[PDB]
Amino acid sequence: PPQVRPSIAMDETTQGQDDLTHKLSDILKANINVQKLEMDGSPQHIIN
Amino acid sequence: LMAQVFFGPTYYQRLRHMVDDKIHARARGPVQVLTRQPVEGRSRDGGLR
RNA sequence: UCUUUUAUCGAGAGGU
């Protein structure tokens, strides 16, 4: 839960995200990427 | 006095360490957000370690 | 009848 990943407010009108948010987002991006390739066109050396 | 005293003018100089810039105390000030503990600092009503 | 805000990471200069 985001009690573990807090989001800081920078110049009051800007706010970044603690690392685990961006990293989970990147893992999920890579998940949606891994889905498509092995569901249709698969050049083998693009899956692994 | 039963003893004589060595006496004379010497050249003294005064540094930049003042007690008015070091005294500190806290009752119940603010906390952080990540752990809800006291904060690190003096100009923020901080707490000692 | 209260309450009432101080980013973050990093670097350096210092005091016992």
Resolution in A: 3.8
Contacts of B39 (CB under 8 A, 6+ apart): B29, B30, B31, B32, B45, B46, B47
* Method of determination used here: cryo-EM
Q: Cα B21–B24–B28 angle (5° rounding)?
A: 145
Nucleotide nearest to B33 (CA to C1'): C7
Contacts of B40 (CB under 8 A, 6+ apart): B46
Q: Distance between CA atoms of B3 and A28, rounded to whole angstroms?
A: 87
* Protein residue minimizing CA–C1' distance to C15: B17
Alpha carbons within 13 angstroms on the beta-carbon side of residue B28 total 0
Diameter over CA atoms, chain B? 67
Distance C4 C1' – B16 CA (angstroms):
35
Q: Give nucleotides in strand C with any atom < 7 A to a protein C-beta.
A: 5-8, 15
Look up tokens 């692994």; give the residue. Answer: A48
Q: Are B21 and B42 in contact (CB under 8 A)?
A: no
